[PDB]
Amino acid sequence: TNMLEALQQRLEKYQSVEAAAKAENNSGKARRFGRIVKQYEDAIKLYKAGKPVPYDELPVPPGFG
Fold first, then answer.
1. Chain centre to alpha carbon of residue 33
2. Which one, out of 9, 14, 19, 56, has a CA that is 20 to 30 A from the CA of 45?
3. CA atoms within 13 A on the CB side of 44
């Protein structure tokens, strides 16, 4: 992948986790992955403008691929 494709595919993975958590009313997990989704979307906004992306901040939680 290029980096934008990699950001999108990981975003989509975490959106799926967020949605599955909501489908179980797992409030903590939905909030955790909603925050992660927001961080990936913020990174994509920066990438799309050519601006510095804080990769060091982007979570990659163990156990979720």
1. 7
2. 19
3. 16
Resolution in units of Å: 1.1
**Distance between CA 19 and CA 54 in Å, rounded?**
25
Place of tokens 């156990």: 63
CA dihedral 22, 35, 54, 11 (to 10 degrees): 10
Number of other CB atoms surrounding residue 19 within 10 Å: 12
What count of residues does the chain have?
65
Contact 65, 20 (CB under 8 A): no
Torsion 9-13-15-16 (CA) sign: positive
Distances (CA, A) of 21 to 17, 32, 49: 6, 10, 32
